């Protein structure tokens, strides 16, 4: 006759996580590496998005 012994399944090989990096670099060098910095009363805030 024909008998069913066990069940077979394929196991995942490697786990992969990805979120979208998709963007531009980011305006940081112009802040930290800037040649000159603003005074403590004419305040320079740069927007980052």
């Amino acid at each position, epitope marked *: 006759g024909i008998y069913q012994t066990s069940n077979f399944r394929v196991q995942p090989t490697e786990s992969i996580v990805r979120f979208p990096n998709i963007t531009n670099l980011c305006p940081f060098g112009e802040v930290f590496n800037a040649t000159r910095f*603003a*005074s403590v009363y*004419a305040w320079n805030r740069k927007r980052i998005s």
Partner: nanobody
Amino acid sequence: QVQLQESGGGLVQAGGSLRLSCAASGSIFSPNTMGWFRQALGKQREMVAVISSIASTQYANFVKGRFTITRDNTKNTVHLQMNSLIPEDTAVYYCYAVDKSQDYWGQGTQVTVSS
């Protein structure tokens, strides 16, 4: 990179007149607030006049009644009308632009009056 061009210095005898100027060629966020600073060799920076583009005068008492400044809103240029020069008031002058984002300084102009 907002750049200010300073010119109008030189050597003038006692009682003469000098015409300084600084121009703002940058983006200039919002209405700005022009200014000027006087620093003698070996002293701090003594501001002369920091008139806003609108009002408030803001004139120091060091040279009261002698120095006046004009505004040209067409090109946002600045001119200084210096009169009755005295050797005590001779020093290095720097144009100051407050702006909205950050404030800048000129390269320096030399004013020397003696007799």
